[PDB]
From a paper:
The [name] E3 ubiquitin ligase is a central signaling hub that integrates inputs from plant light‐sensing photoreceptors. [name] contains an N‐terminal zinc finger, a central coiled‐coil, and a C‐terminal [name] domain, which is essential for proper [name] function (Deng et al, 1992; McNellis et al, 1994). [name] regulates gene expression and plays a central role as a repressor of photomorphogenesis by directly modulating the stability of transcription factors that control the expression of light‐regulated genes.
Author numbering:
A (entry chain A): 351 to 364, 372 to 407, 411 to 631, 643 to 675
B (entry chain B): 406 to 412
The structure:
């Protein structure tokens, strides 16, 4: 009842945007994708004006993912299609670290919230690599059996990561003992393209089986399956907060689910065969960033 | 191919 629609409050008309992410204060956001350019925008300027990024950093390869540092305001990590994981400073435009151990494209990077100098990546090379910004070599390496689409730190502790794998499972590791995952969550019927935490104990996933799923990582239980969107092929984006899940669709529509309800609360047609390619809630608010395969960016807000 | 999930 609370929300029935997504309102468009701003649009930046346009290349696939692989990632759209807010900085630690939800003040700036960044986009990156196939055009090899990490762009930073001021959120309030975008909402209030009738355009230009405040930072543009060119890269050697297409980007798959961005993650802002949760403590250092100005630092943002990227993963790219060459496998390189880079930490950048958006004020100086410097690449601070270039981590080059992955042998194939890296699909994701994630900075830890609670140990903010730690970041984790996953790759088509089937490795999870944990990095520290004060060290050039990886700190932890997990050799897995299938391509890795996403790795995400638990929001409450840097000891736990969720790994979304092409083997259709979520592998939940305690990095203090990587011999076996704590638990492997089965239920998806295709690759797990995203994993995102709603809270310390609640994990969501997306898959190219056209479902989202919710899981309990305290008691290692399946919770719920969400359906309505079309996602059989692409990285279409997943973002969650304390109560809501949002994802893209190959129908060029953004979908929003409340975590207790298996069918969508609402959806938005972006306005061809375009796909939504990136989504990001503004923390626990009804406001969201979205982008699609044409490079269009929209700021949306859930509304009654 | 870009933004295509591994099988």
């Amino acid at each position: 009842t609370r929300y029935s629609r997504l309102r468009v409050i701003a649009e930046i008309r346009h290349n696939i945007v692989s990632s759209i992410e807010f900085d630690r204060d939800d003040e700036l956001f960044a986009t990156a994708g196939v055009s090899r350019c990490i762009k930073v925008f001021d959120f309030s300027s975008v909402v209030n004006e009738p355009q230009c990024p405040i930072v543009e950093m060119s890269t050697r390869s297409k980007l798959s993912c961005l993650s802002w540092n949760k403590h250092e305001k100005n630092h943002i990590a990227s993963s790219d299609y060459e496998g390189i994981v880079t930490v950048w400073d958006v004020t100086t435009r410097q690449s601070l670290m270039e981590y080059e151990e992955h042998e194939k494209r890296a699909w994701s990077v994630d900075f830890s919230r609670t140990e903010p100098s730690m970041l984790v990546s996953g790759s088509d090379d089937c490795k999870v690599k944990v990095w520290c910004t004060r060290q050039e070599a990886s700190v932890i390496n997990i050799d897995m059996k299938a391509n890795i689409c996403c790795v995400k730190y638990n929001p409450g502790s840097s000891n736990y990561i969720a790994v979304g794998s092409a083997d259709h499972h979520i592998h939940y590791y305690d990095l203090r003992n990587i011999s076996q995952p704590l638990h492997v969550f089965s239920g998806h019927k295709k690759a797990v393209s995203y994993v995102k935490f709603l809270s310390n104990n609640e994990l969501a996933s997306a898959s190219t089986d056209s479902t989202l799923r919710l899981w309990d990582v305290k008691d290692n239980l399946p919770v719920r399956t969400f359906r309505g969107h079309t996602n059989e092929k692409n990285f279409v984006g997943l973002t969650v907060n304390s109560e809501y899940l949002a994802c893209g669709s190959e129908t060029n529509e953004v979908y929003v689910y409340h975590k207790e309800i298996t069918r969508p609360v609402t959806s938005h047609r972006f306005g061809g065969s375009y796909f939504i390619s990136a989504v990001c809630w503004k923390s626990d608010s009804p406001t969201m960033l979205t982008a699609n395969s044409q490079g269009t960016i929209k700021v949306l807000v859930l509304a009654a | 191919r870009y933004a295509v999930v591994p099988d």
